[PDB]
Amino acid sequence: VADHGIQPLKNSLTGVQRVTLTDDRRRSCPYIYKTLATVTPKVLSSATLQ
Amino acid sequence: DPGLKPSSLWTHKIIDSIIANRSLSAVQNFRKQPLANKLTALEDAIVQPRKDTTPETVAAILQELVAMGALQPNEVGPMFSDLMIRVHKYNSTNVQNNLSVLLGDIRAAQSEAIRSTNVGELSNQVVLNDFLSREPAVVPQGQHNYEAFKQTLRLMVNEAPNVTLFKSGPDTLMQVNIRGVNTVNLNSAFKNLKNFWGVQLDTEIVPGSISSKLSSNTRVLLLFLAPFTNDSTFTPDTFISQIMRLYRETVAASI
Amino acid sequence: YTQINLYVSFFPMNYDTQSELELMLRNATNDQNFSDYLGAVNNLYQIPAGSSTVVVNIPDRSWGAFRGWSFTRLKVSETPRIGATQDPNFQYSGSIPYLDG
Amino acid sequence: MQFTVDPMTEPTYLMLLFGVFDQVINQPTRSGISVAYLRLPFASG
Amino acid sequence: MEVYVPPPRVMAPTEGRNSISYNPIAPLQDTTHIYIIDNKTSDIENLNIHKDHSNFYTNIVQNVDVAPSDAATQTIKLDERSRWGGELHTILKTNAPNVTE
Numbered sequence: 001v002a003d004h005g006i007q008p009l010k011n012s013l014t015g016v017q018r019v020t021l022t023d024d025r026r027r028s029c030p031y032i033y034k035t036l037a038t039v040t041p042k043v044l045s046s047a048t049l050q
Numbered sequence: 051d052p053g054l055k056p057s058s059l060w061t062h063k064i065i066d067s068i069i070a071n072r073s074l075s076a077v078q079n080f081r082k083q084p085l086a087n088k089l090t091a092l093e094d095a096i097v098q099p100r101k102d103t104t105p106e107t108v109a110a111i112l113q114e115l116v117a118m119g120a121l122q123p124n125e126v127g128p129m130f131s132d133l134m135i136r137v138h139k140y141n142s143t144n145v146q147n148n149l150s151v152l153l154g155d156i157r158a159a160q161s162e163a164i165r166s167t168n169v170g171e172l173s174n175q176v177v178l179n180d181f182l183s184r185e186p187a188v189v190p191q192g193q194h195n196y197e198a199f200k201q202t203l204r205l206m207v208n209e210a211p212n213v214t215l216f217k218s219g220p221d222t223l224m225q226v227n228i229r230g231v232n233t234v235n236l237n238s239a240f241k242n243l244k245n246f247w248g249v250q251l252d253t254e255i256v257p258g259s260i261s262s263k264l265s266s267n268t269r270v271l272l273l274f275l276a277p278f279t280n281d282s283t284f285t286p287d288t289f290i291s292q293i294m295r296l297y298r299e300t301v302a303a304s305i
Numbered sequence: 306y307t308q309i310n311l312y313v314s315f316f317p318m319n320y321d322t323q324s325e326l327e328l329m330l331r332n333a334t335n336d337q338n339f340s341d342y343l344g345a346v347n348n349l350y351q352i353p354a355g356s357s358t359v360v361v362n363i364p365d366r367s368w369g370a371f372r373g374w375s376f377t378r379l380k381v382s383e384t385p386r387i388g389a390t391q392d393p394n395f396q397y398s399g400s401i402p403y404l405d406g
Numbered sequence: 407m408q409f410t411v412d413p414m415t416e417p418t419y420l421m422l423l424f425g426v427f428d429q430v431i432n433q434p435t436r437s438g439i440s441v442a443y444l445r446l447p448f449a450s451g
Numbered sequence: 452m453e454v455y456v457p458p459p460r461v462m463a464p465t466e467g468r469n470s471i472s473y474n475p476i477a478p479l480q481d482t483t484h485i486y487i488i489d490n491k492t493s494d495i496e497n498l499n500i501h502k503d504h505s506n507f508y509t510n511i512v513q514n515v516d517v518a519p520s521d522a523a524t525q526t527i528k529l530d531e532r533s534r535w536g537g538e539l540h541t542i543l544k545t546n547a548p549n550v551t552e
Contacts, residue, residue, distance in 0.1 A: 002541045009535035012451065015512055015523035019487055021505040022492055030506040031551075034544035035504055036488045041529060043469050044536040050143055052325070058332040086370075105434070109328060127324035131331070131436040138435065279341070337434045345423040346448045349414045361407045361422060364517050365475065372425030378411060384434045388497030390415040403421060449474055451526035 009041055052113055054106045059220065061087075065095040107149045108133055114156055174207045174215045181222045181236060192247025195284045195291070199275075206278045224274075231270060239268035249289040260289060277301050344372065349384065349403075379403055424448065472528040475516070485511045485514050485527065 023029050060079075067076040080088070112126045112133075121129070137145060164170060182200060189196045190226060207213060214225045221237035243267050264272075276297035284291035318326070329335055352359045384403045385395040409420065428446045443450065464470065471479045487509045487551075491500055498508035512522045529535050 005468040006536040009537045010530055011529050013527040015510055015525050016508050017487060017511055019507055019509060030503050031545050031547040032504040037539055039485050039537045040482050042482055042536050043533045045534045046477035047534050048532055053330050054326050124320035124324050127327045130328060135435050312420050331433055333432060338432050341428040344426055344428050346426050347423045350420040350422060352418045352420055355413050357410055357413050359409050359420055376422045379421050381417045381419055384417045384419050386497050389500035450524050451528050
């Protein structure tokens with residue numbers, strides 16, 4: 001169970017989401033049967049003006 | 051403008067032309083509209099969409115450097131996208147004031163060219179030479195009455211004492227001091243006079259159905275131009291050459 | 306596939322005339338908008354063998370600018386499922402009426 | 407909607423296509439395009 | 452004689468600055484939680500037809516009202532006015548042996 005930091009979100013999160021899970025050597029690991037994650041949006045800055 | 055400005059902004063302006071300044075023509079167009087065209091003008095009363103004026107301000111000074119001959123017209127292609135990519139990056143209040151002061155020097159440079167030369171005395175001709183531009187200039191069944199009608203219309207612009215000759219959005223009006231029905235639409239008067247140049251008064255079963263298709267718009271235009279013409283004008287024994295010697299002698303006699 | 310190239314075509318417009326057009330098409334008012342000619346949302350609803358009726362169901366949505374309906378049966382063995390990389394249950398190489406007409 | 411078809415011998419689909427609109431593009435700066443997809447009634451968003 | 456008329460308050464606007472937007476239900480002027488589970492990726496097709504839990508394509512909308520495959524294709528629209536940020540919190544399970552191919 002991990003806990004990552006802040007990373008910027010896109011402004012339009014689509015319905016179908018690409019979840020690609022790989023090893024160190026850029027290969028599709030077949031030994032995963034259960035994976036899930038949570039994403040919570042927060043405000044970092046404003047792109048309004050000035 | 052280059053132009054970066056759209057024309058006919060009625061979806062943003064029809065709702066504050068009815069509430070503010072109470073336009074009757076804007077009401078008649080608004081009731082005619084379908085329900086989908088009508089709901090896209092009721093929100094623009096409530097919230098007005100804010101437009102970024104930065105690319106219209108940057109393109110305003112690239113056209114001035116072309117106008118002063120500083121750079122060739124093929125260079126505002128690449129140089130515009132090289133200056134917009136700088137103000138997207140380094141956007142600040144000190145930059146947004148630098149665009150306005152440079153833009154304030156564009157209008158102040160050309161307003162000095164208006165007051166010193168006194169082209170406001172020729173403000174009638176500028177609106178009028180813009181009107182005689184998009185016209186076809188070659189009419190079927192005509193072409194000697196049509197060329198002579200423009201020359202007597204340019205004579206009225208210069209010789210009449212007070213003619214304003216302003217314009218609305220699509221067309222060009224014309225206002226003289228005879229009270230009441232001052233205004234004459236010059237655009238819809240030239241669609242009524244599209245066929246009536248080379249008409250000769252021969253084929254009439256009954257008199258009428260030639261002079262009755264002259265609407266009340268273009269008949270007043272034939273009344274304003276009647277004193278400023280002659281008989282060394284429109285080619286004789288035609289329909290327009292006998293109007294202009296009938297309307298002349300109902301003004302030269304009514305004095 | 307051996308080799309694959311992409312071909313484009315340049316109109317040789319004069320750079321003075323092009324620079325006026327290139328300046329006007331970079332507006333937010335001169336946005337180039339397009340439209341799919343069919344203008345449709347395609348839904349494939351299962352009808353089992355021997356059954357006569359099918360009941361569709363759409364819950365509450367915003368139906369502004371609705372245009373109409375269109376419907377025609379298609380057989381399962383002839384209609385594939387598109388967006389997968391390979392359909393192993395699709396063993397048919399005749400005419401596919403779902404994407405051809 | 408409740409359709410009624412003839413009973414065939416093998417399973418079939420039903421290509422039901424709702425007539426919707428479908429709209430899209432600006433180049434504000436070189437090497438840059440932003441797009442906005444929209445369709446009504448079935449809005450994707 | 453100088454009656455204090457108080458200002459009527461505004462009730463700060465919906466669809467505002469921090470507004471996770473979904474069209475039929477009401478938006479949220481808050482932070483929220485979305486999930487990428489491997490229970491769903493089931494009953495959606497043309498996204499995994501033979502695919503492992505390494506490469507799988509999930510639905511994050513969780514809308515039982517409009518379903519299935521129309522819960523997908525709809526987007527969760529964050530606001531353009533703010534620049535957003537997401538915290539990632541993952542959970543893994545595996546059964547990898549010692550010696551393998």
